[PDB]
Amino acid sequence: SAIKPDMKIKLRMEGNVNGHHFVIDGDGTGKPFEGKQSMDLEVKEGGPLPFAFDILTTAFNRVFAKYPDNIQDYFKQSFPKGYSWERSLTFEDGGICNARNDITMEGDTFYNKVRFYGTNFPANGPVMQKKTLKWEPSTEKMYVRDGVLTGDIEMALLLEGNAHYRCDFRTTYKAKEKGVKLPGAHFVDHCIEILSHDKDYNKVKLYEHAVAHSG
Structure with missing residues (x-):
């Protein structure tokens, strides 16, 4: 009831990567029950970014995932009050990112x-x-450990020359309201795509499609 079939999405990201500060605003729309969403992104501060825009794109909401009726949808049940998540992105060459989103x-x-x-x-x-091409489609393993809803993903960036560049994700998810029922263990399939961008990636159009399933 709280989630409409068509939702707008507003986003601000404040970041610092290898010492370079930036701010990116996002304006998008999506269909929560189809697990689809699109966003227009614009670097407002710190452009042109001196690093691959792809490292940021999964930080630009698991509400936008198609959940079947026989898996508890923790994310849609988190609203209207909302939820937050925190994520570590550990890249194989030692690059480390931490990200967080407070969603209302x-x-x-x-x-x-x-x-x-x-x-x-x-x-x-x-x-x-700036030699990255895209994230490969992934499967996020969702489970509850120590009372905390957690998603683990072995991610990979496709590089120019067709090599891959590995990144481990761990995200923890927490509803703001007490007593939201936790789901059983399950999986979410993800694909994410840069649809368009200008030369310096000051403007980027982004898309994600996500579908939950059981083992």
Whole structure:
């Protein structure tokens, strides 16, 4: 009832990656029950970014995942009050990112306060050299450990030359309201795509499709 079939999405990200500060605003729309969403993104501060835009894109809401009726949908049940998540992104060459999103709802709009921090990226690595092409489609393993809803993903960035660049994700998810029922163990399939961008990635159009399933 709280989630409409068509929702607007507003987002602000404040970030610092290898010491470079930036701010990115997002304005988008999506269909929560189809697990689809699109966002227009614009670097407001700190452009042009000197690192691969792809490291940021999964920080730009698991409400936008199609859940079948026989899996508890913790994220849609988190509203209207909302929920927050925190994520570690551990890249195989030692680059480390931490991200967080505080998500609220007002009417038909999701608001997203995103923080992004990154460090230890090598100067000659694919992130600082902007040699990434896309994230491969992934499967997020959702489980509850120690009372905390957790999603683990073994992610991979496709690079120019067709090599892959591995990144481990761990996200913890927490409803703001007490007593939201936790789900059983399950999986969420994800794909994420940069649809368009300008030369310096000051403007980017982004899309995600996510579908939950059992084992």
